[PDB]
Amino acid sequence: QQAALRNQQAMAANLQARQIVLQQSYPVIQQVETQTFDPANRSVFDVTPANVGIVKGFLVKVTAAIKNNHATEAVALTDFGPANLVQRV
Amino acid sequence: APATIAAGATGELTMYYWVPLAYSETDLTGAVLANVPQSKQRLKLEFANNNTAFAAVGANPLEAIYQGAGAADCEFEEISYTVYQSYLDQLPVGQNGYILPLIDLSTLYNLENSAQAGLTPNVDFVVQYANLYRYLSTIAVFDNGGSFNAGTDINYLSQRTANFSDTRKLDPKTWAAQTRRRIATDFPKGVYYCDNRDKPIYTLQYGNVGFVVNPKTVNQNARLLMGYEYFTSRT
Amino acid sequence: NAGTDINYLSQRTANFSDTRKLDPKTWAAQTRRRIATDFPKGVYYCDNR
Amino acid sequence: QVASNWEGPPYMTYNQPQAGSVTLPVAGYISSQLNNYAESLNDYLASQAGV
Amino acid sequence: NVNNPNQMTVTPVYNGCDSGEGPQSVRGYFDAVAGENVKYDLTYLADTQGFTGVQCIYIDNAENDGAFEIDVEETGQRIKCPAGKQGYFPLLVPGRAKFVARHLGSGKKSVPLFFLNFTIAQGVW
Amino acid sequence: NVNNPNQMTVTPVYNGCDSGEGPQSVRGYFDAVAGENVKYDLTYLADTQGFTGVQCIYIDNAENDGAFEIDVEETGQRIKCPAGKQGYFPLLVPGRAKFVARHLGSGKKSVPLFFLNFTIAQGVW
Amino acid sequence: MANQQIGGSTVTYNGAIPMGGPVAINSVIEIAGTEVLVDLKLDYATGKISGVQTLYIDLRDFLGDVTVTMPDTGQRITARAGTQGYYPVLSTNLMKFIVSATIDGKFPMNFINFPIALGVWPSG
Amino acid sequence: MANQQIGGSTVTYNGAIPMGGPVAINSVIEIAGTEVLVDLKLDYATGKISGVQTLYIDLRDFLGDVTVTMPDTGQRITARAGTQGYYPVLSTNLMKFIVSATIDGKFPMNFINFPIALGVWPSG
Amino acid sequence: MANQQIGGSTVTYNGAIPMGGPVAINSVIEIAGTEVLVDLKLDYATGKISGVQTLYIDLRDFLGDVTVTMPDTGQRITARAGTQGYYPVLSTNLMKFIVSATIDGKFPMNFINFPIALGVWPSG
């Protein structure tokens, strides 16, 4: 098939340009939002990222302050544990 | 995260997530070029409220964080989040404009989850792969009605093709042996991982491949959660 | 101390612009991505390879 | 000794897709190609018979 | 629970699309009745002019004390407007545009009425 | 009940399609109505500007205690809005747009009102 | 919380404008003991009406309710006691209909085939 | 007076005509055990239905209410007790649905995918 | 007797299909003392939503009424107490909204931007 040579020549020009961007550009990591809330009020939030360059991922740091108000009994961590702090992304 | 939170105590938790767009650091496939004028770039996030993070004893601890006899009075005091964006600045500009990996930014790299039901003991349960995606990994969580077991409720797991042909029909201990040479440990009990990074499941150039779980014991309201990871383009 | 005496670690360029500016727990998270552990208490690593 | 339709031994290559071949077409598609349909059957039978 | 089909059904054709002319209504009152049936024969207007159908209807029973029926002939549709209401009603009318109106009020009620020929959705405020 | 036809009906033309300009509306208010009839003469706007017709109307009687009528001139349609409601009402208005409003409240009620120029279906919540 | 459903159907429907015209079908019925079947498959094959899209049910004199059921879908639209109405309907290329009532009565019904939005003449 | 807001959620929807067909999905719901999750992401990926745009909810014999929730949006369409109805929904490429009720019941539910205007059979 | 008005305003609107997508915005409102202002001018300039055309107002658990007011046109759509509903609104390119209620409470609100017709779940 003659159409499998152009789609391999388009991969060769693409991989030539990938190693130009990764070698001749600057990796930046900057904070876009931070917010502290109470989950009784709201728990779904929207984050507007920065519109610059070639975005290649997000690092999300979630903290919590769980308090047990029971009289005598305790709770224990589940198997998934703190990975259930973000319900959906 | 602390292992237990006693009556009257307060536990401090922290947790990090990497939401990927590009496939890796050296492979810019799935990356996003966000230098567009009227950009609609967006990152939604939902968090655990006081109804989904504390399960009672005998409940389903799947989306929960803590579970015990005192979960009826557990509550959050705060949740704080911080988002950091990793990107590449100072792109090479030429005479005709930007120099970019064009069919690397045209490709998406996606992560989806689902939930299937209808499991019967000693009957194969097939979940079909979508024909438009090139699947890279598969994660199956056998949630056996609020109970998780370390392989003692599954006969086998497989990746069956369209005719009837199986490609990896393994015992749950031998299935875990294949993931131990990838992530060097075991996933938690009930979680099963299938790696296809050396040869992705395209299921458009070789038939209709499905994912099979043959269970041994099925409780009431037992479901099978299926996480996917795949490439997507317009070829 | 384990990051409790630092507000943020950063790296600036000529026009005073931070190219990374992270929390001490987020600075240590990028360390764990490379050496699969934490450096000892008070040591902060920055990879630029 | 070369043949213009010989794809290899016919009991080993009859159900084999070609090299690139993401999705295969059908060999014919009144409603579509007709003499291209008839020559796509003659070329296949010449592969199974060796000139 | 037994099932029983039926013998024969009816099949007419309608005017559910847009006019080649513009939207045009026809104000049909001076029908002060209380005891009779009132025929509207719009076949006069359908061929002398380009009034190529009746699609919707507007009935105004704001001071009428009883209901108000209008019947289409070749279709057999039997739209009845309520007592003190008013509104728009879509219709199933063929090219032979004929209508028969009725009444149940307390004397002749002078009900204003409009034959629309274009599409307006239901609402019976 | 015997079938009796009638003598004569009328036929005006309307504005049921989309504007060549944009969707527009006209607000009519400060309606301190001690005198009952109030004229709205939108013919000033139709020829000077591009306000090429009134198709729908929005009446807001949320604080009105009585009903509220609006009358079209060439058509004779006399849409009445209920007491404590608000909603949208399609209209049959010709190219020479004049309106007459009236009232049955307990003093002047100020009645915010909109002449809508495009198509909005019925709903009188 | 949030247990997962096992099996659901997937059916094709009629939603466009036919190559003919707006064509309804008067199908006045009488139940009088239990049920009435309406089969319009003969009209679909023999060049007539191309698929029911809307129902017009007219029960202003009937003292009970009237139910119309599609067998290929399972939708069971139930018109109320003294009301008239237009009802959009989920019907297939197989036009079978199970009509029911309580005891008696005759109801004019129009199988309409073109889209008309919903409405019911009295409310409450 | 004049208290500005901080966070809103922008999200894309399904509002056009499918280039497949008008395709609805019967997914009869069993409650009096939990809340019910419906996931149609498998149908969207495997070539079937493109996106739920309208709901048909049939509550004729039920004594309570029925709530259907979209998780990407937060829309909480709540059908009432003895009524049937068509309801347009704001739903994304994720076709996940949280179905709930008060006590019991079996509900015929149709995930319609084409626009049908709203209506409810009895009102009040 | 036969009086004529003096002054009336003219406003240009949003009434067509966006060349983006069907896009609604969840903007959950808590008033709890007086009033709440919503300003969507920032989204309109920064490439997001083109203009609000419909509201979805969800008042099931709220025991009073809810008023939403457009400032450019003066339209003041008022939702009833225990009802949900879709409401077309007359809004300008300046997409400001003044939401009000009686006393308390939180209710979901969606700013829809594409035309949906009316509808209110219980009536009367």
Per-residue three-class SS string for chain G: CCEECCCCCCEECCCCCCCCCCECCECCEECCCCEEEEECHHHHHCCCCCCCCEEEEECCCCCCCEEEECCCCCCCCEECCCCEEEEECCCCCCCEEEEECCCCCEECEEECCCCCCCEECCCC
Which residue is listed with tokens 């031998």? B174
- Residue B134 φ/ψ region, left for φ over 0, alpha for ψ in the -120 to 50 degree band, beta for the rest: beta
Q: Which chains sit next to F, with 3 or more Cβ pairs under 8 A?
A: E, I
Give the CB-side neighbour count of residue B47, counting CA atoms within 13 A: 27
Count of CB pairs separated by less than 8 Å, G with H = 97
Give residues with Cβ within 8 angstroms of B155, minimum separation 6: B122, B214, B215, B216
Alpha carbons G77 and H121: distance in angstroms, whole number: 9
G76–H86 CB contact, under 8 Å: no
Q: Which of G1, G10, G124 sits opposite H49 (nearest CB)?
A: G10
B114–H41 CB contact, under 8 Å: yes
Token couple for B42:
């967006």
B34–A53 CB contact, under 8 Å: yes
Residues E87/F122, Cβ–Cβ less than 8 Å: yes
Q: Which residues of A fall below an 8 Å CB-CB distance to H?
A: 42, 44-46, 88
Alpha carbons A67 and D6: distance in angstroms, whole number: 77
Phi and psi at residue H4, to the nearest 5°: -70, 160
Q: Which chains sit next to E, with 3 or more Cβ pairs under 8 A?
A: F, G
Q: From the DSSP assignment, how many helices (H) and strands (E) are in chain H?
A: 1, 12
Single-letter amino acid, residue G13: Y
End-to-end, the C-alpha distance of chain H in Å comes to: 35
Determine how many CB atoms are found less than 10 A away from the CB of residue I47. 15
**Which of D18, D21, D23 to probe by mutation at the B interface, max B CB count within 10 Å?**
D23
Give residues with Cβ within 8 angstroms of I50, minimum separation 6: I14, I18, I20, I44, I113
Residues B106/B233, Cβ–Cβ less than 8 Å: yes
Alpha carbons A78 and B68: distance in angstroms, whole number: 9
* Chain C contact for A61 (CB, 8 A cutoff): yes
Q: Which chains sit next to I, with 3 or more Cβ pairs under 8 A?
A: B, F, G, H
Q: How far is G90 from chain H (nearest CA, A)?
A: 8
Pairing state between β H66-69 and B79-89: unpaired
Q: What is the largest CA-CA distance in chain E?
A: 55
Phi and psi at residue G108, to the nearest 5°: -70, 130
B115–H39 CB contact, under 8 Å: yes
DSSP assignment of B68-114: ETTGGGEE-S-EEEEEEEEEEES--B-SSSB---HHHHSSEEEEEEE
Q: How far is H100 from chain I (nearest CA, A)?
A: 15
Give residues with Cβ within 8 angstroms of A54, minimum separation 6: A21, A25, B28, B31, B32, B33, B34, B87, B88, B91, B100, B105
Alpha carbons A21 and B90: distance in angstroms, whole number: 9
Sign of the alpha-carbon torsion through H90, H92, H94, H95: positive
**Which of H30, H41, H72, H100 to probe by mutation at the B interface, max B CB count within 10 Å?**
H41
Residues of I in contact with B39 (CB under 8 A): 47
Count of CB pairs separated by less than 8 Å, H with I = 96
Residues B134/B201, Cβ–Cβ less than 8 Å: yes
The distance of Cα F57 from the centroid of its chain, to the nearest Å, equals: 5
Q: What is the largest CA-CA distance in chain A?
A: 76
Q: What is the largest CA-CA distance in chain B?
A: 68
Give residues with Cβ within 8 angstroms of H69, minimum separation 6: H75, H76, H97, H98, H99, H100
Q: From the DSSP assignment, how many helices (H) and strands (E) are in chain I?
A: 1, 12
Alpha carbons B63 and H56: distance in angstroms, whole number: 30
Q: Which of H5, H10, H73 sits opposite I36 (nearest CB)?
A: H5
Q: Which residues of F fall below an 8 Å CB-CB distance to E?
A: 1-7, 9-17, 75-82, 85, 87, 89-90, 92, 121-124
Residues H29/H100, Cβ–Cβ less than 8 Å: no
Sheet holding G35-39, edge to edge: G35-39, G96-100, G66-69, G78-79
**Which of I17, I19, I26 to probe by mutation at the H interface, max H CB count within 10 Å?**
I26
Sign of the alpha-carbon torsion through F108, F109, F115, F121: negative
Alpha carbons B88 and B84: distance in angstroms, whole number: 13
**Which residues in chain H are followed by a discontinuity, with C-to-N distance exceeding 2.5 angstroms?**
none
Q: Which residue of B has its CA nearest to H95?
A: B114
Token couple for B168:
């990896």
Alpha carbons F110 and B187: distance in angstroms, whole number: 70
Please state, in angstroms and as integers, the Cα–Cα distance from residue D25 to each residue in A31, D20, D46, H47, following that order: 50, 13, 20, 19
The distance of Cα A43 from the centroid of its chain, to the nearest Å, equals: 18
Residues of G in contact with I124 (CB under 8 A): 123-124
Which residue is listed with tokens 């990871």? B229
Host H or E run for residue C24? helix C24-35
Q: How many residues does chain E have?
A: 125
| Bridge partners for E13 per DSSP | G23
Token couple for B15:
């947790």
Q: Could you tell me the CATH number of the domain that includes residue B111?
A: 2.60.120.20
Q: How many residues does chain D have?
A: 51
b/e map E10-46, b = 16+ CB within 10 Å: eebebbbeebeebbbbbbbbebebeebbbebebeebb
The distance of Cα I80 from the centroid of its chain, to the nearest Å, equals: 14
Residues B182/B195, Cβ–Cβ less than 8 Å: yes
Token couple for D17:
């897709």
Token couple for E41:
């024969």
The SS3 of residue A11 is helix
**Which of H11, H12, H42 to probe by mutation at the B interface, max B CB count within 10 Å?**
H42
Q: Which residue of D has its CA nearest to A3?
A: D20
Alpha carbons H123 and I83: distance in angstroms, whole number: 12
Residues H107/H26, Cβ–Cβ less than 8 Å: no
Residues of D in contact with B204 (CB under 8 A): 22-23
Q: Which of B53, B55, B52, B50 is nearest to B67 (CA)?
A: B55
Residues A54/B87, Cβ–Cβ less than 8 Å: yes
Token couple for B226:
């299926």
Residues I5/F40, Cβ–Cβ less than 8 Å: yes
Deposited resolution, Å: 2.8
Which residue is listed with tokens 């005998």? B58
Residues of F in contact with I90 (CB under 8 A): 25, 58, 114, 116
Alpha carbons E31 and H100: distance in angstroms, whole number: 54
Q: Which of G106, D13, A31 is nearest to C23 (CA)?
A: A31
Q: In this structure, what is the dihedral angle of CA atoms C12, C13, C18, C24, given to the nearest 10 degrees?
A: -30
Q: Which of A17, A37, A53 sits opposite B88 (nearest CB)?
A: A53
Residues G111/G78, Cβ–Cβ less than 8 Å: no
Pairing state between β G119-120 and G84-88: antiparallel
Residues of F in contact with E88 (CB under 8 A): 90, 122
Pairing state between β I66-69 and I96-100: antiparallel
Q: Which residue of D has its CA nearest to A8?
A: D20
Residues of I in contact with G117 (CB under 8 A): 117
Residues H78/H61, Cβ–Cβ less than 8 Å: no
Q: Which residue of B has its CA nearest to A77?
A: B66
Alpha carbons I61 and F90: distance in angstroms, whole number: 32
Q: Which of H74, H90, H29 is nearest to G3 (CA)?
A: H29
Which residue is listed with tokens 């290899």? D8
Q: Which of C20, C21, C26 sits opposite A61 (nearest CB)?
A: C26
Instruction: Provide the chain G residues 6-35 that lie in CB contact (below 8 A) with chain I.
Output: none
Residues B162/B209, Cβ–Cβ less than 8 Å: yes
Instruction: Provide the chain B residues 141-200 that lie in CB contact (below 8 A) with chain A.
Output: 148, 188-190
Chains B and D touch (3+ CB pairs under 8 A): yes
Residues B19/A87, Cβ–Cβ less than 8 Å: no
Residues A46/A30, Cβ–Cβ less than 8 Å: no
Residues of E in contact with F92 (CB under 8 A): 25, 58, 114, 116
Alpha carbons I49 and G114: distance in angstroms, whole number: 34
Alpha carbons G79 and G96: distance in angstroms, whole number: 18
DSSP E strand boundaries for chain H = 9-12, 23-26, 29-30, 36-39, 54-58, 66-69, 76-79, 84-88, 96-101, 106-107, 109-111, 119-120
Token couple for I115:
């035309």
B82–C23 CB contact, under 8 Å: yes
Alpha carbons B230 and B30: distance in angstroms, whole number: 10
Token couple for H102:
């008060």
Alpha carbons I74 and B223: distance in angstroms, whole number: 52
Alpha carbons E6 and E8: distance in angstroms, whole number: 6
Token couple for D41:
């059957």
Residues B28/B86, Cβ–Cβ less than 8 Å: no
Pairing state between β F38-41 and I3-4: parallel
Apex G80 CA angle, E109 and I86, nearest 5: 85
Residues F90/F55, Cβ–Cβ less than 8 Å: yes
Alpha carbons B132 and B233: distance in angstroms, whole number: 9
Token couple for G77:
């639209």
Phi and psi at residue C36, to the nearest 5°: 60, 25
Sheet holding F56-60, edge to edge: F86-90, F56-60, F113-115, F24-28, I9-12
Residues H61/H106, Cβ–Cβ less than 8 Å: no
Give residues with Cβ within 8 angstroms of B193, minimum separation 6: B137, B138, B139, B179, B182, B183, B187
Q: Which of I85, E125, I55 is nearest to F122 (CA)?
A: E125
Instruction: Provide the chain G residues 31-70 that lie in CB contact (below 8 A) with chain H.
Output: none
B84–C26 CB contact, under 8 Å: yes
Pairing state between β F68-72 and F80-81: antiparallel
Q: Which of G88, G26, G44 is nearest to E94 (CA)?
A: G26
Q: How far is G47 from chain I (nearest CA, A)?
A: 35
Residues of F in contact with E86 (CB under 8 A): 79-80
Alpha carbons E31 and B63: distance in angstroms, whole number: 70
Alpha carbons B127 and B163: distance in angstroms, whole number: 15
* Chain G contact for H116 (CB, 8 A cutoff): yes
Alpha carbons I111 and I56: distance in angstroms, whole number: 7
Sign of the alpha-carbon torsion through H103, H104, H108, H112: positive
Please state, in angstroms and as integers, the Cα–Cα distance from residue I86 to each residue in B49, F85, H90, I109, following that order: 29, 16, 11, 10
Alpha carbons B193 and I78: distance in angstroms, whole number: 53
The distance of Cα C21 from the centroid of its chain, to the nearest Å, equals: 8
Alpha carbons B157 and I86: distance in angstroms, whole number: 48
Alpha carbons I95 and H5: distance in angstroms, whole number: 13
Residue B164: domain span: 95-235
Give residues with Cβ within 8 angstroms of B207, minimum separation 6: B161, B162, B163
Q: Which of E39, E33, E41 is nearest to E101 (CA)?
A: E39
Determine how many CB atoms are found less than 10 A away from the CB of residue B36. 11
Q: Which of A37, A55, A65 is nearest to B15 (CA)?
A: A65
Pairing state between β B66-68 and B54-55: parallel
Token couple for E68:
């108000």
Alpha carbons F88 and A17: distance in angstroms, whole number: 59
* Chain A contact for D19 (CB, 8 A cutoff): yes
* Chain B contact for C30 (CB, 8 A cutoff): no
Q: Which residues of B fall below an 8 Å CB-CB distance to I?
A: 37-40
**Which of F17, F19, F21, F25 to probe by mutation at the I interface, max I CB count within 10 Å?**
F25
Give residues with Cβ within 8 angstroms of G98, minimum separation 6: E3, G35, G36, G37, G38, G68, G69, G70, G71
Residues G99/G39, Cβ–Cβ less than 8 Å: no
Q: Which of A59, I45, I5 is nearest to B82 (CA)?
A: A59
Determine how many CB atoms are found less than 10 A away from the CB of residue A62. 20
Alpha carbons F43 and F64: distance in angstroms, whole number: 28
DSSP assignment of I33-73: SSEEEEE-HHHHHTTS-----EEEEE-SS--S-EEEE-TTT
The distance of Cα B114 from the centroid of its chain, to the nearest Å, equals: 9
F125–I120 CB contact, under 8 Å: yes
Give residues with Cβ within 8 angstroms of I100, minimum separation 6: I31, I34, I35, I36, I66, I67, I68, I69
